[model samples]
Target: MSGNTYGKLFTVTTAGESHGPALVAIVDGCPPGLELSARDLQRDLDRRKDEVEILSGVFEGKTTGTPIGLLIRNTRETAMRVAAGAIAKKYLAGLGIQVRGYMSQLGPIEIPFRSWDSVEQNAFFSPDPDKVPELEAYMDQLRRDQDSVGAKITVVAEGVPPGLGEPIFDRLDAELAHALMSINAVKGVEIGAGFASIAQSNNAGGILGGISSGQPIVAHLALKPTRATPIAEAMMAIVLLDQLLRQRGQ
Candidate 1:
């Protein structure tokens, strides 16, 4: 399968397989001297420390301002990979580009890295500090019983420009569905209030019509069981297909 790079103005291409020696991405068209370094890249990479499969060794963080190549290796027994456009958006945002996506799960578990205060307080990308104790208790149980748990988390992006979407296929909700479904464990992607709409008669209109009410575009994703779980294979495949289709042109 071919890896994807996204962005009309800022393109990024991620490479390597889930279990291959490493995962690599090349960011194209980024402006020069925006104060980028390997350290910055590593900081983002470190966020995946819980996933033993992820390994990083970006060369000097000096992306030539042309197509900067970023590489990460999978040291875990299981294979791991991600899209380049996703990484590019993150890197650009670090440089103050103002992009947001609380969209998909970074992994089976939730880490508190969302809000500014949460980032300073939590270790596993969790936004709520109150959950820390419960998480710790869960972790302790896993340690004692040689087991792990997978959690489903939702990420929402606010403050989007109203005109950024199109009238049809490329509409905001459509695009977001394409992106979220691209993750490895996501089961479904919806905009606005999400599955709550499913309980009503008008739920089908959201994705079927590609309509946004000029309000904040909301992306809700459901995470499947952790890869360590009994049905992990099926769940992973579903999420991967969503991403594969997302990268394809409609």
Candidate 2:
């Protein structure tokens, strides 16, 4: 576990076990005078840490052109949760499934249908073009209110075939549920329409009998908002390639 370093020029080394004394991080190769300080790192760390302190490499409240050491203690719970969620995302990508996710709900507000092309035009990732003004106004109010918000994410995967999962012990839906639920703030997961399908005539999420039905897989993830992040995007190219591969196999 000694090779726990990342990056080439600006490397970061992370050490410590799940039940270790503390998680230690060393940031190396930071440029000489970047006005760096512990306060700069606190913003992100504070949001996720139970306790984080700068142990060394800071002089006069700024970086001293050397390796900076950070002592992050009491972070095992949060760290493991976040890591599991991240690893789940990575696992999907490794399986050749292109996972795309977008915010379908923010706080108590819900987004209406617009089009895929318009998702890039707004800050909140709303699908409705006309509601952008209203959404912005609400966001402004929320900011002033200092209110923390939660969001719902919808993740879709293309290129998944009809038979990629097991039946009894390792169902496709079961694995998907497990992976998505591992995320730190995720509360629930739905395949296709999820709860909405109860009122609908059909289950539109595309899986049947723990196997793909050759349609695009749709899943909705309920997340309790801690921070805003970009949603994953659908992989049409991978879907096309999968189709080609299947045709050749036939």
Candidate 3:
């Protein structure tokens, strides 16, 4: 009974045992069958601390609808997840859909969405470059307490077509909820305006009736002071692409 799987139309399953320095991610359900291994190999070369070895899934340099396999040791666990997400990220990018995530709040402090440029150059991936020092101080204070607080991350997807997501049981919101909550430290997730949208009833920010409403899709997730940004963005991306495929198929 292992609940280590994420997504449906596009799925990522983390299996096997880690003795501290190694992990495996079995990525499945890629519909495009593109040669993403070449792309993700670039992810290992550039972003990773070391190399990533692909174990299985491609034949003659293209996806065979087989599960994509890989192994990691000491280098990272989340990067595998992120790289697995990169498969979907790049695919979505090809469709002109963009997904991004950033730190909006740390502890009791909150910040505004400034620009994508400012998010770089900070260890916390914060958009407020001027407030990095303040955030550093807050982190330092939390380090002493060893018992600090949670954070909020906002993930936004732009250029997504309307018509994605299913109507009843396999709702888009439910899939997003499942995908985000699958992250290691994710504590909670919110879609559009679940509550507190000026009065009480919301325009839902973007989605309505489990389907996208031709507006930008915005989702916020609460984390317990951890998990990288790419992973969150990846999860959000995978779900959209999955739904995009599902929407087209029907």
Candidate 4:
């Protein structure tokens, strides 16, 4: 029922509940000489207009280059359900970071590993390039069966400095796990190859070897089956354990 906020130089806290009249956020400890305006704040809120509103004067025409406060009014009934997300966006923006979320649901798509390429191209936000047809076929069957499939999502944020992450416990993996778990139905999270590593050595090898090999640091997340279907507790546990391991040595 309560939302907790976390950050270093830039801070944000969320108040109010899902069914409450309004959801609000307070931002503190912003650095000086940054150009911030109502539009900059409004743009994010506009995307979730059904949820929140940005209050003026709090930002003071422009930030005083000191601690600034921000408020977003909840226009929706279940603000707590999604308003925390808005707070995250605002906090990240204040620190010059970008955040985005994706969702994959049961649909008309088949997802054989070999056909993952098609899934990438046709259905979910998969990264492969060759399995679109099979994914489509699977999705088609799922639809016919009156059932749906769930999937993992990745959020890629560029422009991050190399050293912003702590190598040990507070590393990027830990932060990402916290972020994904904040979502309503998300159960587990991974970075780079997920469970496939447990099945074989190559996946785990890449992680242990600490080899980027010029590829971007990837953040991957697995979602439990939607509550709309039967709950997938086992799937959820696997993801949670992965998050715990990732936080290790950090």
Best by TM-score: 3
Tens-digit lDDT track of model 4 for 1-250: 4556644434445566645665665555543444565555444333332223444323444445454444445453223223333333443456464443332333323233333234323334333444445556766777798865566554444333333344566555555566556665567666667765766522321132332222234455566556211112112222222233333435
For lDDT, candidate 1 versus 3, the one ahead is 3
TM-score, cand. 2: 0.53
1-250 per-residue lDDT for model 2 (tens digits): 6755533334456777868787776765444444444444443333232245667665776656577676667535334222212222333445575545556887778886567667656676667788788878888898998877787777666656676445675555665676566555778888788786586423656678766776777777787756322322212222222232333444
Q: After TM-score superposition, what is the CA distance of residue 193 in candidate 3 from its true location, in Å? A: 3.5
TM-score of each: 0.60, 0.53, 0.85, 0.57
Write one digit per residue (lDDT tens) for candidate 3, span 1-250: 2877777667778854544666778888876467666556456234322355677887877777788887765535466567677778877877788887788888888977778788756767688887789999998898998876888888888888888888798788888988888887898888875554657523564788888887888888888853457778878887887788777775
Best by lDDT: 3
Candidate 1 lDDT score at position 117: 55
Regions of candidate 4 where Cα sits further than 4 Å from its true position? 45-61, 75-148, 199-215, 227-250
Instruction: Report the Cα lDDT for candidate 4.
Output: 0.43
> Across residues 1-250, which tens digit of lDDT does each residue of candidate 1 receive?
6646544445545666666777666555554544455444444334444322212322354334556565565662112223233334344345343332331233334554446356335554456666667667767777898865455444433332223445555655565555556666667755555666556523332233554333443445666645221122212222222332333334
Where does candidate 3 stray beyond 4 Å?
A: 32-35, 38-50, 59-65, 74-79, 201-203
lDDT of 1: 0.44
Better of 1 and 2 by lDDT: 2
Which scores greater on lDDT, model 3 or model 4?
Answer: 3
Runs in model 1 deviating more than 4 A are 3-9, 18-21, 31-33, 50-65, 73-116, 142-149, 197-216, 227-250
Please, what is the whole-model Cα lDDT of each candidate in the order they appear? 0.44, 0.56, 0.75, 0.43
